[PDB]
Amino acid sequence: GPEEDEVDGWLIIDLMKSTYKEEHPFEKRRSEGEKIRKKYPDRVPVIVEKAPKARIGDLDKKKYLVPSDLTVGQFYFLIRKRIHLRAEDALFFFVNNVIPPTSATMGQLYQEHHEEDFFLYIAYSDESVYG
């Protein structure tokens, strides 16, 4: 459920819409996120999860470390291929419940949308409204 974490004198409220967040306590996630960012300042750590209601393939692995210059379009290609999605079937990414432009880079998305644990969370679905 909704979580509250204190960082730098702020009480951070997180609606916790992520299986990964539910299974990994905030302190552990932020500690790992800090470590990955320090070790690889040029890479973007992404947690990729299927929207619950989406009737398409699930991912076997959620954790991707991608170059900052990888485009959203290239990441679509990778995810689509990994879940064996036919070309006739739609796939949408959501970051903070908004579909990012295919032309955006993963570094841009990280800078605009990374969470208080230093991970970027992307959900995906077969439909353009998240659910």
Author numbering: 1 to 131
Give verbatim excerpts from the published study on this entry.
Mammals conserve multiple mammalian Atg8-family proteins (mATG8s) consisting of GABARAP (GABA type A receptor-associated protein) and MAP1LC3/LC3 (microtubule associated protein 1 light chain 3) subfamilies that tightly bind to autophagic membranes in a membrane-anchored form. These proteins are crucial for selective autophagy and recruit proteins bearing LC3-interacting region (LIR) motifs. Many mATG8-interacting proteins contain canonical LIR motifs that have a basic hydrophobic LIR motif with a core consensus sequence of (W/F/Y)-X-X-(L/I/V), which binds to the W- and L-sites conserved in mATG8 proteins using the amino acids W/F/Y and L/I/V, respectively. In this study, we identified LIR motifs specific to the membrane-anchored form of each mATG8 and characterized the residues critical for their selective interaction using cell-based assays and structural analyses.
The crystal structure of the LIR(TP)-mATG8 complex has not been reported previously. We failed to crystallize the LIR(TP) mutants bound to mATG8 proteins but succeeded in crystallizing and determining the structure of the wild-type (WT) LIR(TP)-GABARAP fusion protein at a resolution of 1.75 Å. The conformation of LIR(TP) was unique compared to that of canonical LIRs, where W35 and I38 bound to the W-site and L-site, respectively, in a canonical manner; the region N-terminal to the core LIR sequence (residues 28–33) formed an intramolecular β-sheet with the core LIR sequence (left). An intramolecular but distinct β-sheet was also observed for the RavZ LIR, with the region C-terminal to the core LIR sequence forming a β-sheet with the core LIR sequence. Meanwhile, the W to T mutation within the core region of LIR(TP), referred to as LIR(TP[T]), which makes this LIR motif atypical, induced selective binding to membrane-anchored LC3C. We noticed that the α2 helix of the LC3 family, whose C terminus contained K32 and F33, was located closer to the LIR-binding pocket than that of GABARAP subfamily proteins (left), a feature that seemed to enable K32 and F33 of LC3C to interact with D33 and I37 of LIR(TP[T]).
